[PDB]
Every structure is written in C-alpha cells, then in structure tokens.
C-alpha cells in the first residue's frame, strides 16, 4: 500500500545578453550604460547561464530595439522579425542562430527619429528541441 | 551543561533552559502528524530541484533516521546546511541523471521526478513516494539592462518668424454684456449708458489676463490725434466722474469698462474709442492694479 | 492614360504630356540639394504654429517617406491639404501640449519649440533638427471699428 500526493512547483530557466565590442565577440560591457557613433557596428549575443542542455537550441523568435527600457512601447524597430532578420537593411547579419545556446546578431548603430536620445534593446527567444524540430529557420521575400 | 547558553541549537528549535535540566525541543509548530505528512516545501532552481522536510517533523514522525531516495538510489538525501532545521536532496535539471525525464508540450517543458520516505532501508506498512514536478516556461521576456547614448552629427538651422495675437473689442447695450452690434455706425443719447467691453478672439489662455494699461476717446478713427479724452489712465480709471466704473480688469480675458455717453466740444459730430491692452501673466504679476488719489 | 489631360497632378508639378508617355515631375525650381536643405517657410498663427517643407524638395533629397516629428512624438506630419505641394504639421501655440515652451520677457512673449526630420524611424549619418521659434508681441494696438453719433440737446 502506497500513498501519492501530487506536488508543483512553478520555474524559471536564467536568460541574459550581453554587448560584445569585437566580431570576435570576445568582452561584455558592465557599465549601466555605453556611448557609440553610427559608424561603430554593434555586436551582441545571447547565452544561457543555465540549463546549456545540448538538444535546446536558441532561436530568435523576434528582436526589437525600444527608446525606454519599457519594453510594452508602440515605438519599436524590429530587427529580427518572426524568426528572420529584417530586409532591406544590409547591416543586419546574423551569423548563429539555433545551432548552439550561442546566438549572436550583428548590426551597426543606429538612433531613434525625434527627442529620443537613449535606445535600449529587448528580444524574444524561443528554446527549440533538437529531436523533433530542425531547429534552423529558412526565409525569403514575402507575399510581394 | 556542556555548552552554557542556548545558541547552540536551531533557533526554530526551542531551547528549554532550565537549573539541572537542559535540551531543545519542538513546539506546537511542529507537533502533529497528519499536517506534517501533508507538511513540505519545494524549490525549482535554474539547473537544479530541492525537496525539503522539517527534521523535527521528521523526528515526531517517529522517523528518527531519515532515508530519502529517488527513483535512482544513486541520489541520496542529506543535511540542508543552510538552515539547519531543513533536510533536503538535489537533483540536476536534465533528463538521464538521477531517474529525471523530461516531458515537454508546445507551451513550456516540465520535469518529473519521484521522491521515496522511509524510516530504514525496508518498509513494512506505508510506503510514501513523494511526485513533484517543476514546470520551466519555454517562452519568456528578456531585456538588455546597459542602454545606449549614440552619437550624430546633426545640423541646427536657426528659424524665426514673426507673429500677433488677434484682440477685438464689442460694444453690448444692456448692463449684461448680451448683444454685440454689427452696424459701422450707431445713435446713441447722452443719458445712455454706454457698455463696453474687450475680448480675445484666439489665444485664451488661463495664465493672460487682460489689463487696460489706458484707454481713451477720440473724435476720428485716426488714433494719433492730439484731442484724447483718457477714460483710463495708466491702469485706473479717470476720477472726477462717478459714471466711469470698470466691473472686470485684470481678472480674466474679459475686460468691461462702463462709462455713460459723452460728446467732443467743437465741431465734432462722430466719436470713436480706442484702448491700449497689455497682457498680464498671472504667474508672476498679480494683475490686480489698485490705486488711489494723485500727489495733490 | 488612366487620366486624359495635365489637371490631375498640382499645378507646381510640371506634367510631361506625350504620346506613349506621361508623368508629371519637377523642374529646375525644385532641384537641388543644398539650398533645399537651406529651403523651407513658417508661419505663425494665432492660435497655432506651422512648419511646412516642399513635397518635391522632400522627393529630390531622396526621402521618398518623409517622417517629421516634434519634441512630442504625439504630433505628426501630414499633407497640407490646402496647397498639395507642402507637407506641414500643426502646433497650438501654448505650454504644455506638443512639447512646446513658454519663453517670455519684458517687451513680448515667444514660443519655441523643434522639428525633427528623417527618412525613416531610425537616423543612420545626418539628424537634422529644425529650431523655430514665433515672437507674439504683448503690446498693441486696437481700434473699435463702429463709430458713435450721439444725439445733445
Ligand atoms: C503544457 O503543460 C503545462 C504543464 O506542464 C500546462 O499548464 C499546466 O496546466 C495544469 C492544469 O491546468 C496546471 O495545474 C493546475 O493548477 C491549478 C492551480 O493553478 C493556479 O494556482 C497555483 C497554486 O500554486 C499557481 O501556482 C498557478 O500559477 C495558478 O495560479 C490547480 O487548481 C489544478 O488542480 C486541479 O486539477 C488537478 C488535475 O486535474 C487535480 O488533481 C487531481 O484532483 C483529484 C480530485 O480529488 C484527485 O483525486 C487526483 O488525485 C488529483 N491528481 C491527478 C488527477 O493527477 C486537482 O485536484 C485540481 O482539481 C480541481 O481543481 C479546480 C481548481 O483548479 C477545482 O475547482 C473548484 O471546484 C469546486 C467544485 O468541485 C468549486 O466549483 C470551486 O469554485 C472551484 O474553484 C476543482 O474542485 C478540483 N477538483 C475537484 C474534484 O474538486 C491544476 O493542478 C498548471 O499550473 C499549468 N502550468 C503552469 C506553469 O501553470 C499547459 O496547459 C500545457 N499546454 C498544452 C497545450 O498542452
Ligand atoms: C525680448 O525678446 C525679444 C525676442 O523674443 C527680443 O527682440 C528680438 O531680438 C532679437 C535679437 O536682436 C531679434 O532677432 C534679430 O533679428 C535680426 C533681423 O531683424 C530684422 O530682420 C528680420 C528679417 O526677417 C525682420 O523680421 C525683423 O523684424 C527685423 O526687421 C537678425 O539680423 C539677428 O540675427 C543676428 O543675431 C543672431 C543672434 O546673435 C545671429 O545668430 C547667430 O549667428 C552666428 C553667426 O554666424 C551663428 O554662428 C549662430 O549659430 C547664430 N545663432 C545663435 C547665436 O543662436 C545672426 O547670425 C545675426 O548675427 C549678426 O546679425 C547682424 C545683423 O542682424 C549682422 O550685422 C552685419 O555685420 C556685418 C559684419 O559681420 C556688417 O557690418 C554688416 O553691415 C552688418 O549688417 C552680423 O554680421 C551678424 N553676425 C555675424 C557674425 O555676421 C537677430 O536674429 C528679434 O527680431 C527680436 N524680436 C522681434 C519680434 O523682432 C527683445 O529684445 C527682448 N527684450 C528684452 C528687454 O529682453
Ligand atoms: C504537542 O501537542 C500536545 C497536545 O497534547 C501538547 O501537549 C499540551 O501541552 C500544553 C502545554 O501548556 C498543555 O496545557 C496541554 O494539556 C497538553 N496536552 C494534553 C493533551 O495534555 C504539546 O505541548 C505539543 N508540543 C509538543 C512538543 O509535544
Ligand atoms: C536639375 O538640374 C539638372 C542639372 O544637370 C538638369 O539637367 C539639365 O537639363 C537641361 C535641360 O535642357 C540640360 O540642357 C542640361 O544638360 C542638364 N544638365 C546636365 C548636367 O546634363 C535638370 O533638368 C534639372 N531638373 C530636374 C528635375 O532634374
Ligand atoms: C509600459 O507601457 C505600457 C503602455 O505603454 C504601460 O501600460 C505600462 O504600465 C508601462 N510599464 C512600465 C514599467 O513603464
Ligand atoms: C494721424 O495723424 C497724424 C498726426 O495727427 C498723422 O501724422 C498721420 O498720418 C495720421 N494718420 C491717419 C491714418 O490719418
């Protein structure tokens, strides 16, 4: 005879990015905050301090950039847009996404139109299994 | 008494001090047994799951030594070494080690793993295997903390344009300030009374109040004629003539002055009115002129 | 051919009427490139302050969008709706709303406030921010326009 009582407990995996300077992605930055020109190209990649299971992949769901760390503003500049970089913008490569807990995306510096002096970053990111889906996005133009 | 005060023991273990008798032992807190079966805590970590039990639970269990175990017995359980009170085990967040698996849906994946109680390595009447599950959302918000300051080389061109506020004033006949005329010209008695009021027709805004810094007559439309008659002087009104009285200035873009009708000595048949106005802000000013007789 | 004759497109947009081809396009008075950063015009209003630049300026500068913003992002540009070459914005002329300032002295009051003007959300080499500013005068002068002919015995 044995007794079963049922017991949940609700988790959070660990997420952060960090702002590379080289290609090499190579130093984080630790201020609270940086100053750039248009010209610099900035590179930032993301990592999981945690749980780094081999079959999870990163996949970049969408990435936005914000003028306010509020990340709920009408005003975003979407960088990575449904699992795809966003055309018509040369700058925006992407050399690793889903392949490994290793995602980096490169574009050079840009500044919001109007009073806005700070811009801030925000992403989304979707952890894939490597068992069932491939895990490797594929896109081209849209509906034209 | 080998140790002479009660820091030693848990501080969620009371200490009962006493002369000739000394120990620590629960409380009502930690007394019954039904509860305490139905008593537990759980933690789900980034990398790792901890389940805890009270010891002193334990011990008024009847569990004196505690053996818990998993669905590998490899996992062992072991002392909190945190807060004494506790015993708990670890078990990393995968799917392989330690008998975890790993079930996953389209929202978020979810850990199961089972936990086993037993006072000794046998059990003889209850067996009790604790289910716990960790659910780790598979969707979540992260954002960048270091925000950014770019530099532009921007250009500033310097542009001025130059301006005027619209200002009218009305002549009302009834002492209500009613009805404006529309006619180029009017008819008037000298026992009329003539009421006469100024008025913003863009620009209202709360903080202009309208001050009449002088206001005066003149027998043509032509407002540089040497023959004024002042019926305000340098914000107050010209005494000497009791009909002059002014409801409103200074308080609000409604400014009212009433005079009763008067006539030009000469020639002059027409009369006309002309006034000079400065804005006032509130802010600042107090807009509310108040005078007095002159030097005499 | 979807429209016979020239009367569709604006009077400032030269039309090129031919067989085989039309269209209608700038000439040499909306042409080029510096004084057109150096063209624009103002007016102040009453109540309100407007800025407008030249659609076909706009267009030979390469801004195929035009996104003019203020202070407040709550205002923005749109067609003149008047006289189809301009494109304006509007602001009311007080403290508070759109961003604009009160700065006041002795003789007249004035308002300040900046355009900001770009080809998209972002601004990769030139932020060009246009300062403007109108002068109210706070004295002047009024006239009653309806004169009296009083009656005496
Ligand atoms: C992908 O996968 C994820 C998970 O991996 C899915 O998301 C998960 O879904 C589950 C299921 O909905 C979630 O668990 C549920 O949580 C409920 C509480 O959640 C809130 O409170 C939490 C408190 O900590 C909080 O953390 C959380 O964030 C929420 O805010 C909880 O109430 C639910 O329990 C009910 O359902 C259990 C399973 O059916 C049931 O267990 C069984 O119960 C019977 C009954 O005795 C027992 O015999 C069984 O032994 C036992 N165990 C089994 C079957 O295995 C519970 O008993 C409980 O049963 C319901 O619960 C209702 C309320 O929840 C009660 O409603 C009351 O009813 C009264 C009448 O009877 C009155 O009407 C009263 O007004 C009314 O409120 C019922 O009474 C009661 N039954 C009975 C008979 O009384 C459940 O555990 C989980 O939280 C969630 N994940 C996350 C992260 O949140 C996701 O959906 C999946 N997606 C896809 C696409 O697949
Ligand atoms: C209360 O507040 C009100 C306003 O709120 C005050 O009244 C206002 O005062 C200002 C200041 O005087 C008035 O603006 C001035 O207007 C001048 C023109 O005004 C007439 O023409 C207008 C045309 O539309 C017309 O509408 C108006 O009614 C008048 O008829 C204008 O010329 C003035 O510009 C000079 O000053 C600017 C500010 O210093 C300066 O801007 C800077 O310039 C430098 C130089 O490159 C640049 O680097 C800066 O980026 C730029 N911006 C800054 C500093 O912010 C202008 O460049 C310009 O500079 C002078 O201008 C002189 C003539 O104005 C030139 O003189 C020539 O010089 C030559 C030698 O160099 C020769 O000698 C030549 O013969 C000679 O003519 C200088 O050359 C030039 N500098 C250089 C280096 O070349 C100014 O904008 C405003 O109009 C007025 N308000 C109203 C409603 O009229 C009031 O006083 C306040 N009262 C109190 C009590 O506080
Ligand atoms: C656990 O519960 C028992 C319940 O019996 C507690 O014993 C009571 O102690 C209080 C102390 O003031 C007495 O007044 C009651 O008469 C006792 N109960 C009975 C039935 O006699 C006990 O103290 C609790 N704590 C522990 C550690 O056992
Ligand atoms: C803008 O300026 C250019 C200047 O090049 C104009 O092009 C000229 O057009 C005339 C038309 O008779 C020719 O004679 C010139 O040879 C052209 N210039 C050159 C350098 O070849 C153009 O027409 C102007 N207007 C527009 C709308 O571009
Ligand atoms: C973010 O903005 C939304 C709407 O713009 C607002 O509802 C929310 O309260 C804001 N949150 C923070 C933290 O600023
Ligand atoms: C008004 O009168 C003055 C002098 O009396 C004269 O210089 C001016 O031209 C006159 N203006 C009009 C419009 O009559």
Redesign the interface.
Same mark, same amino acid.
């Given at each position: 005879? $044995?007794?079963?009582? #049922?017991?949940? *407990?609700?988790?959070?995996?660990?997420? #952060?990015?960090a702002?590379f300077q080289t290609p090499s992605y190579t130093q984080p930055?630790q /201020?609270?905050?940086?100053?750039?020109?248009?010209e610099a190209f900035?590179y930032?990649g993301?990592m999981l301090? /945690? *749980?780094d299971?081999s079959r999870f992949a990163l996949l970049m769901?969408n990435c936005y950039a914000t003028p306010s760390?509020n $990340?709920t503003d009408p005003?975003k %500049?979407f960088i990575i847009q449904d699992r795809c970089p966003h055309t018509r913008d040369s700058t925006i490569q992407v050399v690793e996404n889903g392949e490994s807990s290793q995602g980096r995306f490169s574009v050079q510096?840009? #500044?919001? $139109? /109007?009073? @806005? =002096?700070?811009? @801030?970053?925000?992403?989304?990111? %979707?952890?894939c =299994?490597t068992m069932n889906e491939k895990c490797k996005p594929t896109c081209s133009g849209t509906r034209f």
């Open positions: 005879s $044995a007794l079963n009582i #049922r017991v949940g *407990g609700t988790g959070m995996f660990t997420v #952060r990015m702002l930055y /201020g609270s905050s940086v100053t750039l020109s248009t900035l930032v993301t301090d /945690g *749980g299971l769901t760390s $990340a005003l %500049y510096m840009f #500044r919001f $139109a /109007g009073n @806005y =002096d700070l811009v @801030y970053l925000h992403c989304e990111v %979707y952890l =299994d």
